[PDB]
Design an enzyme around this catalytic site. Sequence first.
Site, PDB file in Angstrom:
ATOM      1  N   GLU A  35       6.498   3.204  -2.676  1.00 18.22           N
ATOM      2  CA  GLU A  35       7.491   2.964  -1.626  1.00 18.22           C
ATOM      3  C   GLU A  35       7.831   1.482  -1.466  1.00 18.22           C
ATOM      4  O   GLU A  35       8.993   1.130  -1.328  1.00 18.22           O
ATOM      5  CB  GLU A  35       7.004   3.458  -0.252  1.00 18.22           C
ATOM      6  N   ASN A  46      20.434   2.421   3.702  1.00 25.08           N
ATOM      7  CA  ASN A  46      21.056   3.591   3.111  1.00 25.08           C
ATOM      8  C   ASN A  46      22.484   3.639   3.646  1.00 25.08           C
ATOM      9  O   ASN A  46      22.727   4.176   4.724  1.00 25.08           O
ATOM     10  CB  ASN A  46      20.281   4.835   3.533  1.00 25.08           C
ATOM     11  N   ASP A  49      24.146   7.178   5.097  1.00 27.65           N
ATOM     12  CA  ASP A  49      23.955   7.717   6.436  1.00 27.65           C
ATOM     13  C   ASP A  49      23.649   6.646   7.467  1.00 27.65           C
ATOM     14  O   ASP A  49      23.223   6.962   8.565  1.00 27.65           O
ATOM     15  CB  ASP A  49      22.860   8.785   6.441  1.00 27.65           C
ATOM     16  N   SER A  51      21.173   4.511   7.790  1.00 33.07           N
ATOM     17  CA  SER A  51      19.801   4.379   8.270  1.00 33.07           C
ATOM     18  C   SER A  51      19.122   3.312   7.406  1.00 33.07           C
ATOM     19  O   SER A  51      19.641   2.948   6.344  1.00 33.07           O
ATOM     20  CB  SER A  51      19.043   5.715   8.164  1.00 33.07           C
ATOM     21  N   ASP A  53      15.107   2.016   5.860  1.00 30.79           N
ATOM     22  CA  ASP A  53      13.702   2.338   5.612  1.00 30.79           C
ATOM     23  C   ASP A  53      12.912   1.060   5.812  1.00 30.79           C
ATOM     24  O   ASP A  53      13.195   0.058   5.151  1.00 30.79           O
ATOM     25  CB  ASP A  53      13.527   2.831   4.180  1.00 30.79           C
ATOM     26  N   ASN A  60      11.819   5.792   7.660  1.00 30.23           N
ATOM     27  CA  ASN A  60      13.225   5.804   8.034  1.00 30.23           C
ATOM     28  C   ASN A  60      13.566   5.737   9.532  1.00 30.23           C
ATOM     29  O   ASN A  60      12.930   6.391  10.355  1.00 30.23           O
ATOM     30  CB  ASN A  60      13.883   7.017   7.378  1.00 30.23           C
TER      31      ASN A  60
END
Length: 130
Positions: A35, A46, A49, A51, A53, A60
């Site tokens: 990750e 992102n 959408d 959002s 991370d 998220n």
Amino acid sequence: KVFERCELARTLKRLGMDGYRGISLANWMCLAKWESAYNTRATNYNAGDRSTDYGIFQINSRYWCNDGKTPGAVNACHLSCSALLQDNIADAVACAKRVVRDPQGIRAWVAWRNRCQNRDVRQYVQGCGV
């Protein structure tokens, strides 16, 4: 902060992650490695959408933390996403624990499915004293 392998393995163990909800430390290490490469400052926007991370586990903002800029997002860990950008990973761990208490467990992270599920993850904790 970018953790070194065994340093992180012991840090996670001290925080109660070993076997948490049946998830081994090696599984957590494999998750953090893929990750963020053990980087607490890792971030990924992102555009699709809107959002973001955050941190070592790339949690998220749509569902887990609040950054105030994700449309219609919730905050299940009840933490500012800023808490997931600290060198101290206690808050990030508390949130990761919150994520796995849900149905999917460790499978919540697609990265874990892609590169940790049904894999030999022994190497992540070898020689760490955990």
